[PDB]
A paper describes a structure:
The stressosome core is composed of RsbS and at least one of the RsbR paralogs. Unlike the RsbR proteins, RsbS only contains an STAS domain. Here, an assembly model of the stressosome is presented based on the crystal structure of the RsbS icosahedron and cryo-EM structures of the RsbRA–RsbS complex determined under diverse symmetry restraints (nonsymmetric C1, dihedral D2 and icosahedral I envelopes).
Diffraction data were collected to 3.1 Å resolution. In addition, a β-strand at the N-terminus (β0) interacted with β1 in the manner of an antiparallel β-sheet. In a structural comparison using DALI, RsbS showed high structural similarity to mtSTAS and to Geobacillus stearothermophilus SpoIIAB (gsSpoIIAB), both of which are agonists of antisigma factors. mtSTAS and gsSpoIIAB superimposed onto RsbS with RMSD values of 1.6 and 1.9 Å for 112 Cα positions, respectively [Fig. 1(c)], indicating that RsbS has the conserved fold of the STAS domain. The RsbS crystal contains five monomers in the asymmetric unit. Interface 1 was associated with the formation of the asymmetric unit. A surface area of 663 Å2 was buried in the binding interface. Interface 2 mediated the interaction between two RsbS pentamers generated by crystallographic symmetry [Fig. 2(b)].
Author numbering:
A (entry chain A): 4 to 119
B (entry chain B): 5 to 119
Write the structure that this text describes.
């Protein structure tokens, strides 16, 4: 079940809306970077509003895809992190300081535009 | 399930899968619910990645557009492929009422302009 990526002008929009799977997150990390490279988008906003909990594997995947996307030249934003997910990100801890984070998808896109 | 994004007062659904008849009704049921929950005035359905479609799914696509109008939301279809265009015409669903655009951004633009 590939997770979709939306291209809106110069931004990539992602919304995860189900329990993530180790095998799925790896495909998502693989797919997002290709989409950045194929489209040359300036910014990505990843929505985890519908993600109840995550594992350490996903946490590392999520942290790496933020770091990798920035290297390819795209500023990244996370939105909708729930308390359960926030705890696991802190506990590894993949709460990278350079994580620009937002409360909601709209706000993240707003923050994304003002950064650029 | 098919994910649906909410940007301000608009719904963006992109179908990057291969949709069977089972998924289409799930989509129809979920989209009409999403409008009612969100209070969205417009929705953009991107069919750019849909290689082909069948007559049954064609019909649900036409019903979704017309049903969402009744709820008060405007529907724009984007990225329809030639193969899909043949099937849509074949059923006769293709009406002047269907508002359509080439890609998601143009479809979203057409939406804001008419609201």
């Amino acid at each position: 079940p590939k997770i979709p990526i939306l291209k809106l002008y110069n931004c990539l929009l992602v919304s995860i809306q189900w329990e993530l799977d180790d095998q799925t997150a790896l495909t998502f990390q693989e797919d997002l970077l290709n989409k950045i490279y194929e489209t040359g988008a300036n910014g990505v906003v990843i929505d985890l509003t519908s993600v109840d909990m995550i594992d350490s594997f996903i946490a590392k995947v999520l942290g790496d895809v933020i770091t990798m996307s920035k290297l390819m030249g795209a500023k990244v934003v996370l939105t909708g992190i729930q308390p359960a997910v926030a705890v696991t990100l802190i506990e590894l801890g993949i709460a990278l300081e350079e994580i620009e984070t937002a409360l909601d998808l709209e706000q993240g896109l707003e923050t994304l535009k003002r950064e650029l």
